[PDB]
Each structure stands twice: as structure tokens, then as C-alpha cells.
């Protein structure tokens, strides 16, 4: 499903991402935007047997189980399909675990290369959250 910018922002605040582990709301809306274009079904197949799933493009190597990736650790204890749902519940819950690793949002290549250090506050401009 394709989320709206304010629409997704609200879902994230509800799930408490605003300032989670010191990352303002804007960082997450920015990360989704560049990672999946806010498409809940976005999928990317890597060169290493791994795949990136959902709106936050979580990798199957360490976070979810898709049954075909080498070195699977399945740290979120979820099947990768849970990450392709129309509701963001599983993606948000797993994301909170990724962020707590010690890498922060640095685990997301899009955040690091496109959001990090910018005016992230613009991402929630005009939202009535």
C-alpha cells in the first residue's frame, strides 16, 4: 500500500518514534521516503542472497526470516512477510530493535546518505499530528 507523508508521520508518532533513541520524527519519515517511497510492499534483492523488505527495507540477513538467506539471525523474530503488511506495526517494532543495536539509524543506507544532517523537520511540515 502507498502511504501519504502526513499519514505515515502520524502512524509513526502513535508508535512513538518521535525522539526514539534520540531521533526526531522527521528522521523516520525521511528514511521511509528514500528507502521505499512510502510503498509498504517495496522489495529489493541483494547480491548476497539477502533481501530488503517493506517501507523501511529491513534486511533478511539479520532481522527477518525469509527462508533463503545465508547467515540468517532472525533478530526481530518475524517472517519477512510480516514486513510487507499494509499496517506498519511489524516494521516499526523491528526498526526499534535495529536502532537499539548501536548503529542508530546508520543501518539505513538511505537515511545516512540523504537524511542525516538535513532539515528533517521539513518532513512533517503541515502535518496536523
UniProtKB/Swiss-Prot annotation:
What is the reaction catalyzed?
Hydrolysis of (1->4)-beta-linkages between N-acetylmuramic acid and N-acetyl-D-glucosamine residues in a peptidoglycan and between N-acetyl-D-glucosamine residues in chitodextrins
Which organism does this sequence originate in? Gallus gallus
Q: List the disulfide bonds.
A: 6-127, 30-115, 64-80, 76-94
As recorded in UniProt, its EC number(s) are 3.2.1.17
> Which family would the database say this protein is a member of?
Belongs to the glycosyl hydrolase 22 family.
Q: Gene encoding this polypeptide?
A: LYZ
What protein name is recorded for this chain? Lysozyme C
Domain of life per record: Eukaryota
Gene Ontology annotations for the cellular component aspect, listed alphabetically:
cytoplasm; endoplasmic reticulum; extracellular space
